[PDB]
Amino acid sequence: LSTITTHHLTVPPGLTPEEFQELSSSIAEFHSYRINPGQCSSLLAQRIHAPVETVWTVVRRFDKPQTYKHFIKSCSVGEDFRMTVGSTRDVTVISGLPAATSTERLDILDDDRHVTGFSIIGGEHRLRNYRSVTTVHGFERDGEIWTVVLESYVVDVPEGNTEEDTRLFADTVVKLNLQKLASVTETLAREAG
Amino acid sequence: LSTITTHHLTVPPGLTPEEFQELSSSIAEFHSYRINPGQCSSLLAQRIHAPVETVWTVVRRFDKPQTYKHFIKSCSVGEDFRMTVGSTRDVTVISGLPAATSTERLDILDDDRHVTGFSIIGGEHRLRNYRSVTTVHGFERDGEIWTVVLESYVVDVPEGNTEEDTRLFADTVVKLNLQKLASVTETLAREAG
């Protein structure tokens, strides 16, 4: 039947053991899921040479995912949008197929603890019933400062797909978007303002 | 009926007018196509802070596209592969769909002029009858050296797609792969060896 993910028990790629030891409690709290047959789940990590709040200022902008994600043709939130849990956005993904819309709901937004997350609630693409959580974490050593971003998801494996089929695709997309996040926020950090 | 592409008559994004003026003859020679209704074509450019031959050493490796492209699960050329025009490779693309194979043929390989190109000759994906050409070009100013990579393609627009549907997708993939090429070759340059 259902099982618990083990992301919080091993070092994900792109994290050092030292970083993992500081983050294991956060991974248990925010990046653990109860999964069912036909679902898969992964945890990805990205080190960023910028302060936490600089990274968080970009991560938290639910209305502007194109600021750090690839393959976004457009994203609309409509008038009267407030940055509050329950809000939705309509994302049009660059897919090489006829353009549709992924409708996504903001599930979590904690500016104190630097946690956000969302669910895909409709849209006809390769990530059915996708739900993800992103957390942002600060590190220091001898006055030097960096950030780690953790992003996990659960998603349905489509009929005819292997788990590897779906997991490798979703991991690749998340990893590439985190690399964009790292580039964008490192530029913001180096330029101050 | 058929028309000629105009890539050689305007500055593509990511190129300066000065760079374009030095490259317009190469764009006419290597990045111009006769296209038909139902096809689209684009030219993309990427500046790289590395010497031409450093970039070319990576660009030319037809057997190892994963060295600079994203979304490659595997690539096989089989025993007795020689780097010669007419050779093929089997590329398995990370697609979130059940894994298949894009069979691709090496169309051009000129180590003197730094031109290569390939065609997708089978594979059941979003880039039917895709053909592309990549050229690598050196620039100098006051002893400083850089490279521009130009990559163009022609591809079929699937039934039900708009030209923008296909062109935005193919452009995004090419642009992201060129960014990876820039990162990989800039690292090779900075480390020498």
Ligand SMILES: O=C(O)/C=C/c1ccc(O)c(O)c1
């Ligand atoms: O390629 C697909 O099949 C879907 C990709 C996708 C779907 C929803 C998003 O928010 C997003 O950034 C990417």
Ligand SMILES: O=C(O)/C=C/c1ccc(O)c(O)c1
């Ligand atoms: O996403 C698709 O539909 C196909 C992508 C694709 C197809 C062939 C390649 O060589 C490649 O790098 C990517």
